[PDB]
Scaffold this active site. Sequence first.
Site, PDB file in Angstrom:
ATOM      1  N   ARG B  34       0.823  -1.198   0.000  1.00  0.00           N
ATOM      2  CA  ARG B  34       0.000   0.000   0.000  1.00  0.00           C
ATOM      3  C   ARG B  34       0.862   1.255   0.000  1.00  0.00           C
ATOM      4  O   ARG B  34       1.991   1.259   0.499  1.00  0.00           O
ATOM      5  CB  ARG B  34      -0.947  -0.012   1.209  1.00  0.00           C
ATOM      6  CG  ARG B  34      -1.421   1.348   1.670  1.00  0.00           C
ATOM      7  CD  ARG B  34      -0.818   1.680   3.026  1.00  0.00           C
ATOM      8  NE  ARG B  34       0.571   2.112   2.907  1.00  0.00           N
ATOM      9  CZ  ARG B  34       1.385   2.328   3.935  1.00  0.00           C
ATOM     10  NH1 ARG B  34       0.963   2.140   5.178  1.00  0.00           N
ATOM     11  NH2 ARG B  34       2.630   2.729   3.716  1.00  0.00           N
ATOM     12  N   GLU B  40      -1.907  10.950   6.829  1.00  0.00           N
ATOM     13  CA  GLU B  40      -0.883  10.226   7.566  1.00  0.00           C
ATOM     14  C   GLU B  40      -1.071  10.406   9.067  1.00  0.00           C
ATOM     15  O   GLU B  40      -1.394  11.500   9.538  1.00  0.00           O
ATOM     16  CB  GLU B  40       0.506  10.714   7.151  1.00  0.00           C
ATOM     17  CG  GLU B  40       1.518   9.616   6.888  1.00  0.00           C
ATOM     18  CD  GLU B  40       1.071   8.658   5.799  1.00  0.00           C
ATOM     19  OE1 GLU B  40       0.288   7.734   6.106  1.00  0.00           O
ATOM     20  OE2 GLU B  40       1.490   8.835   4.634  1.00  0.00           O
ATOM     21  N   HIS B  41      -0.872   9.315   9.811  1.00  0.00           N
ATOM     22  CA  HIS B  41      -0.960   9.327  11.274  1.00  0.00           C
ATOM     23  C   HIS B  41      -2.293   9.885  11.761  1.00  0.00           C
ATOM     24  O   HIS B  41      -2.382  10.483  12.835  1.00  0.00           O
ATOM     25  CB  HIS B  41       0.214  10.087  11.895  1.00  0.00           C
ATOM     26  CG  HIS B  41       1.512   9.341  11.832  1.00  0.00           C
ATOM     27  ND1 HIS B  41       1.868   8.395  12.769  1.00  0.00           N
ATOM     28  CD2 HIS B  41       2.529   9.387  10.939  1.00  0.00           C
ATOM     29  CE1 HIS B  41       3.053   7.899  12.463  1.00  0.00           C
ATOM     30  NE2 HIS B  41       3.476   8.483  11.356  1.00  0.00           N
ATOM     31  N   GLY B 133      10.284  -3.055   5.157  1.00  0.00           N
ATOM     32  CA  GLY B 133      10.684  -1.860   5.869  1.00  0.00           C
ATOM     33  C   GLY B 133      10.701  -0.592   5.047  1.00  0.00           C
ATOM     34  O   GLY B 133      11.225   0.423   5.520  1.00  0.00           O
ATOM     35  N   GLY B 135       8.040   1.195   4.010  1.00  0.00           N
ATOM     36  CA  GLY B 135       6.879   2.034   4.199  1.00  0.00           C
ATOM     37  C   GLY B 135       5.688   1.705   3.329  1.00  0.00           C
ATOM     38  O   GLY B 135       4.677   2.414   3.398  1.00  0.00           O
ATOM     39  N   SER B 137       4.000  -1.027   3.679  1.00  0.00           N
ATOM     40  CA  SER B 137       3.228  -1.970   4.489  1.00  0.00           C
ATOM     41  C   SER B 137       3.399  -3.405   3.988  1.00  0.00           C
ATOM     42  O   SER B 137       2.440  -4.094   3.636  1.00  0.00           O
ATOM     43  CB  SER B 137       1.750  -1.564   4.543  1.00  0.00           C
ATOM     44  OG  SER B 137       1.210  -1.347   3.251  1.00  0.00           O
ATOM     45  N   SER B 138       4.659  -3.849   3.968  1.00  0.00           N
ATOM     46  CA  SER B 138       4.936  -5.268   3.778  1.00  0.00           C
ATOM     47  C   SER B 138       4.385  -6.106   4.927  1.00  0.00           C
ATOM     48  O   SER B 138       3.943  -7.240   4.710  1.00  0.00           O
ATOM     49  CB  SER B 138       6.442  -5.492   3.629  1.00  0.00           C
ATOM     50  OG  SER B 138       7.137  -5.111   4.806  1.00  0.00           O
ATOM     51  N   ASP B 183      -3.512  -0.063   7.022  1.00  0.00           N
ATOM     52  CA  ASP B 183      -2.779  -0.938   6.112  1.00  0.00           C
ATOM     53  C   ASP B 183      -3.528  -2.241   5.876  1.00  0.00           C
ATOM     54  O   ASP B 183      -3.661  -2.695   4.734  1.00  0.00           O
ATOM     55  CB  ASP B 183      -1.378  -1.210   6.654  1.00  0.00           C
ATOM     56  CG  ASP B 183      -0.528   0.041   6.721  1.00  0.00           C
ATOM     57  OD1 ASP B 183      -0.853   1.023   6.017  1.00  0.00           O
ATOM     58  OD2 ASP B 183       0.465   0.042   7.476  1.00  0.00           O
ATOM     59  N   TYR B 227       7.048   5.801  16.634  1.00  0.00           N
ATOM     60  CA  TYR B 227       5.613   5.665  16.378  1.00  0.00           C
ATOM     61  C   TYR B 227       4.765   5.503  17.632  1.00  0.00           C
ATOM     62  O   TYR B 227       3.804   6.271  17.801  1.00  0.00           O
ATOM     63  CB  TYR B 227       5.405   4.462  15.446  1.00  0.00           C
ATOM     64  CG  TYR B 227       3.989   4.263  14.944  1.00  0.00           C
ATOM     65  CD1 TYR B 227       3.009   3.701  15.757  1.00  0.00           C
ATOM     66  CD2 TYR B 227       3.642   4.599  13.640  1.00  0.00           C
ATOM     67  CE1 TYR B 227       1.720   3.511  15.295  1.00  0.00           C
ATOM     68  CE2 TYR B 227       2.354   4.407  13.170  1.00  0.00           C
ATOM     69  CZ  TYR B 227       1.399   3.860  14.003  1.00  0.00           C
ATOM     70  OH  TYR B 227       0.111   3.660  13.554  1.00  0.00           O
TER      71      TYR B 227
HETATM   72  N1  ADP Z   1       7.372 -11.407   2.662  1.00  0.00           N
HETATM   73  C1  ADP Z   1       8.062 -11.315   3.822  1.00  0.00           C
HETATM   74  N2  ADP Z   1       8.952 -12.267   4.192  1.00  0.00           N
HETATM   75  C2  ADP Z   1       9.648 -12.193   5.342  1.00  0.00           C
HETATM   76  N3  ADP Z   1       9.512 -11.177   6.208  1.00  0.00           N
HETATM   77  C3  ADP Z   1       8.666 -10.155   5.963  1.00  0.00           C
HETATM   78  C4  ADP Z   1       7.862 -10.161   4.730  1.00  0.00           C
HETATM   79  N4  ADP Z   1       7.113  -9.042   4.754  1.00  0.00           N
HETATM   80  C5  ADP Z   1       7.420  -8.390   5.916  1.00  0.00           C
HETATM   81  N5  ADP Z   1       8.362  -9.060   6.622  1.00  0.00           N
HETATM   82  C6  ADP Z   1       8.936  -8.662   7.932  1.00  0.00           C
HETATM   83  O1  ADP Z   1       7.971  -7.672   8.349  1.00  0.00           O
HETATM   84  C7  ADP Z   1       8.589  -6.417   8.773  1.00  0.00           C
HETATM   85  C8  ADP Z   1       7.982  -5.164   8.137  1.00  0.00           C
HETATM   86  O2  ADP Z   1       7.847  -4.187   9.196  1.00  0.00           O
HETATM   87  P1  ADP Z   1       7.364  -2.644   8.994  1.00  0.00           P
HETATM   88  O3  ADP Z   1       8.307  -1.783   9.831  1.00  0.00           O
HETATM   89  O4  ADP Z   1       5.848  -2.483   9.130  1.00  0.00           O
HETATM   90  O5  ADP Z   1       7.711  -2.316   7.469  1.00  0.00           O
HETATM   91  P2  ADP Z   1       6.646  -2.049   6.292  1.00  0.00           P
HETATM   92  O6  ADP Z   1       6.489  -0.547   6.281  1.00  0.00           O
HETATM   93  O7  ADP Z   1       7.268  -2.586   5.019  1.00  0.00           O
HETATM   94  O8  ADP Z   1       5.414  -2.806   6.715  1.00  0.00           O
HETATM   95  C9  ADP Z   1      10.104  -6.579   8.519  1.00  0.00           C
HETATM   96  O9  ADP Z   1      10.830  -6.131   9.680  1.00  0.00           O
HETATM   97  C10 ADP Z   1      10.312  -8.039   8.150  1.00  0.00           C
HETATM   98  O10 ADP Z   1      10.887  -8.694   9.284  1.00  0.00           O
HETATM   99  O1  GAL Z   2      -0.133   7.307   8.556  1.00  0.00           O
HETATM  100  C1  GAL Z   2       0.482   6.510   9.554  1.00  0.00           C
HETATM  101  C2  GAL Z   2       0.354   5.023   9.230  1.00  0.00           C
HETATM  102  O2  GAL Z   2       1.581   4.414   9.690  1.00  0.00           O
HETATM  103  C3  GAL Z   2       1.656   3.056   9.361  1.00  0.00           C
HETATM  104  O3  GAL Z   2       2.951   2.583   9.637  1.00  0.00           O
HETATM  105  C4  GAL Z   2       0.591   2.346  10.193  1.00  0.00           C
HETATM  106  O4  GAL Z   2       0.648   0.936  10.047  1.00  0.00           O
HETATM  107  C5  GAL Z   2      -0.788   2.793   9.717  1.00  0.00           C
HETATM  108  O5  GAL Z   2      -1.828   2.223  10.506  1.00  0.00           O
HETATM  109  C6  GAL Z   2      -0.908   4.344   9.817  1.00  0.00           C
HETATM  110  O6  GAL Z   2      -1.109   4.770  11.158  1.00  0.00           O
END
Ligand code: ADP
Ligand code: GAL
EC number: 2.7.1.6
Lengths: 384, 383
Positions: B34, B40-41, B133, B135, B137-138, B183, B227
């Site tokens: 996404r 935001e926030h 990581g 942003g 939303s993996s 997300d 956060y």
């Molecule tokens: N397809 C995947 N395979 C393995 N680990 C994943 C996968 N997708 C996400 N992750 C894990 O999920 C976390 C994503 O955290 P987050 O800070 O919310 O980043 P994002 O903004 O991409 O969601 C990573 O720290 C990683 O460990």
């Molecule tokens: O706009 C801030 C956004 O930050 C993301 O990292 C969070 O997962 C969402 O729920 C939303 O709060």
Amino acid sequence: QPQVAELLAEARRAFREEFGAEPELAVSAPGRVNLIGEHTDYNQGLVLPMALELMTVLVGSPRKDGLVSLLTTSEGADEPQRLQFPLPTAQRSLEPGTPRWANYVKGVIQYYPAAPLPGFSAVVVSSVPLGGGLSSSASLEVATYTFLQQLCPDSGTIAARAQVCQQAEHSFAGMPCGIMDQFISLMGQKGHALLIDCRSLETSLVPLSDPKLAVLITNSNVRHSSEYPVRRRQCEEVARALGAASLREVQLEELEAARDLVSKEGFRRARHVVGEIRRTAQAAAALRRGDYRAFGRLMVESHRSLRDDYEVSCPELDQLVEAALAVPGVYGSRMTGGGFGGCTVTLLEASAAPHAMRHIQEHYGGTATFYLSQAADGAKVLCL
Amino acid sequence: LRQPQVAELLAEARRAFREEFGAEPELAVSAPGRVNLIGEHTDYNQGLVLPMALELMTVLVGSPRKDGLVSLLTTSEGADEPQRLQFPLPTAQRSLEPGTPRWANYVKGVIQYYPAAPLPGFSAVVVSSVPLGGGLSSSASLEVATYTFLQQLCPDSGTIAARAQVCQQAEHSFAGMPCGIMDQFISLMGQKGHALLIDCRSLETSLVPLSDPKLAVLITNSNVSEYPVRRRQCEEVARALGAASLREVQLEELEAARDLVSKEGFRRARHVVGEIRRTAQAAAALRRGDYRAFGRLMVESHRSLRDDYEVSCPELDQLVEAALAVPGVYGSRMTGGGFGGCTVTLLEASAAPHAMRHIQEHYGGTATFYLSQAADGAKVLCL
Ligand SMILES: Nc1ncnc2c1ncn2[C@@H]1O[C@H](COP(=O)(O)OP(=O)(O)O)[C@@H](O)[C@H]1O
Ligand SMILES: OC[C@H]1O[C@@H](O)[C@H](O)[C@@H](O)[C@H]1O
Ligand SMILES: Nc1ncnc2c1ncn2[C@@H]1O[C@H](COP(=O)(O)OP(=O)(O)O)[C@@H](O)[C@H]1O
Ligand SMILES: OC[C@H]1O[C@@H](O)[C@H](O)[C@@H](O)[C@H]1O
């Protein structure tokens, strides 16, 4: 009402008996009922339909033949219920012919935007009554389109799919409908009604999920269809007369100021549209907050408007609505669809449905059929 | 500029599943990443959001097991080692616990809170085009893919919103990340060629078309927490003003309570109240096709996020400024939580090639680009 699994099994048995193997692909698309917002879609207005539990299921497999082999198990279809034809080419294109029911699938194939499209075998099964105003046509078209997506996935937008299915109904079935029926069949979400803005095609999900609330559909079992294109022409005439692109940009007061620029009949036609568009927006808001009796009252205003100003109702439909309003527990009732027959939609307390069915039937000079439906999902793929 | 397709991902995921488990997977599922256009926030403040689903994706393939065990493999390089893991299903006696590797916490959490039974053991491999990581939303992509997968093993009864809340609960309890619903909601609810205006108070949703060949959405990954502190401050300010959440407060009323909150807390609330109002304005601008107006609201959002909420960083600010110098760009701002991640830029389609060249040359680092359209949400893949 039959569920997808039961229908999917029926389509699989028929495909086996007819083609000797198991189908490889499966697809479904529901029928629809319009809660309110009638004859506004081709005026770029608002509509509030929900997908029904009545459904079309298509199972089939690709062919190397470049041929299309079809079988429908619906009895009310035009004979023969089987048909086979070759795929269209740049040289020769599909043509609307007989049997009539196959024209709907032919049109969707002809206007499908992706290539290469292979030949296929398919059987159609449906719980949507053909010709009953619940859009068996749109159910069939969206199912076909969703099926063709498995053979050859498309690129464009969901709106394009609705317009592809609508173009087919125009060119191959000869019915100049709006986008509403195709759109709700494509976009429905279970436990939700869909407020559709037919100008921007923006969509809003309005929750419809109350065990205390039932939606009662009553088929008058009548179908007197040649005035639909006449009403569409009138609305356009009034829009030009007022120097507007469509009746959606026109409100009652401006229509009142310009009364002398349009015909007397034209004025009543436009008054329904302008008033239905606002009624629809009011009903969506009423439904969000659970004001069922407010929604029921807007339903009755819609019927009165459709009966007097738009004149697309009929004695059978009017008789069904009044009987429905006499039953306690009914919030509102009105005709749905194009009119001149078809179905009546009734919002009522679930507990009142059995009594409502008895009362409506007893006070109707004809045979009436009933469907108690919840809001269902739109078109989807079924994994075989 | 780069973007894998679904079939390529599905084929890559099966090869890995075959090499690892010896058979063909029986079930396949996908869930998108996404990008938030604006808002935001505000989601955990019961505000408004305007995200769209991306073509960047997580694909999950797997099969049920007789073992009562869960066997996982992810091919993502940014993932916590080890990328292989096996563990038993939760029981009435012992329940799953967040452990190692960190990435397995996301699937474990969804498993623990899945509302249906009986859940069989399963083998599954995860492949993803969503940068971990970055942003986009993996995390939510992984959770929603998992949830849709478990629906194949054991279909659930509830609503799509209930699925979002399960995936949100998982991120809270097993990942230690108190996120909002946004997300998860968009990953399940996305429709291609549409943005989703989400009212995070009532959960009302509107699909707003985003399908203009003249319009492009440029996502820039800077390739780079605080956060939970921001969420706490918002709660701190809301009680101070006697409100359930910051959504019930308007700018002028916040000024009256300047002496009721801390200096930092006041700036935090000023962003939220203004971001909620900008998001509603940006949706209206989008309906009429006023991209110039939409871009301006995007740039205001960034200023607000940089000054009042302080969730940006030097890299993001550098990317935003460079983008605004490019002709044809309507606006740009950070997306996601902040402190790194990606930048979303709305621009004329014709300007995309130049924008990528300009941004990259004036950025003190290597930048990745995604030219994305609004994509579909979670769906099952028939094998
Ligand atoms: N397809 C995947 N395979 C393995 N680990 C994943 C996968 N997708 C996400 N992750 C894990 O999920 C976390 C994503 O955290 P987050 O800070 O919310 O980043 P994002 O903004 O991409 O969601 C990573 O720290 C990683 O460990
Ligand atoms: O706009 C801030 C956004 O930050 C993301 O990292 C969070 O997962 C969402 O729920 C939303 O709060
Ligand atoms: N499942 C089906 N199988 C074969 N033909 C169908 C099917 N559903 C619809 N059709 C064709 O479309 C028609 C429905 O036309 P229409 O007047 O639009 O009714 P509805 O309001 O149900 O769409 C029938 O006359 C039928 O020939
Ligand atoms: O509300 C009237 C409706 O009637 C349907 O039969 C038609 O297919 C729709 O396009 C819409 O015009």
